[PDB]
Ligand binder design. Structure first.
Ligand SMILES: CC(C)CN(C[C@@H](O)[C@H](Cc1ccccc1)NC(=O)O[C@H]1CCOC1)S(=O)(=O)c1ccc(N)cc1
Lengths: 99, 99
């Protein structure tokens, strides 16, 4: 698909049984989602935004479906105001910026 | 250009005769640059991101050259972790996401 930037690039993602809206965010190194109780080990981590850092939990090799595309990787979980699909997952769906 | 996301999408911009490195950031609504001087009246504003809100100075109708491409729009200035080109200017250069 081609996605235009007049509005926020919001898409539906599937992880487990859970469907969420998320930003295709080229400005985010890693994927960050709001509260969810994923299986597996996690490491605590801190990530820096505008306004400063927040603490997240890092979960590795998590399957995500993004616009019908199955990918697998690290999902950071914590108090992000908005669900973010970062470059770590965007690369896996073949996503480019074009102009 | 087509820009892949295995690395940060950092580009050189020209504003006010100055060359800077900025991040093409589809998750940013607005363009925020690091502390610099720009001329003309500005308005104080507050914007929010991952780790809270920051104070910025809003300058309107500012010419910027992003790669080759000329834009004229709103540039906010303050304590952003990195220079950010948001959607207000990404749209002006005809930037899309494509997978
Ligand atoms: C600031 C860049 C360098 C990194 N951020 C990504 C940005 O796209 C960020 C995404 C976002 C959108 C809306 C609310 C909150 C966050 N937008 C952002 O701040 O919107 C401001 C900047 C101008 O206009 C509005 S990040 O969220 O902090 C971040 C950091 C690390 C990871 N792993 C993931 C995300």
């Amino acid at each position: 698909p081609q996605i235009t930037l007049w509005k926020r690039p919001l898409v539906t993602i599937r992880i487990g049984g859970q469907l969420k809206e998320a930003l295709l965010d080229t400005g985010a190194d890693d994927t960050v989602l709001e509260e969810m109780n994923l299986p597996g080990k996690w490491k605590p981590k801190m990530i820096g935004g505008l306004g400063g850092f927040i603490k997240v939990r890092q979960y590795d090799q998590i399957p995500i479906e993004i616009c019908g595309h199955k990918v697998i990787g690290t999902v950071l979980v914590g108090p992000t105001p908005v669900n973010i699909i970062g470059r770590n997952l965007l690369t896996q769906i073949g996503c480019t910026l074009n102009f």
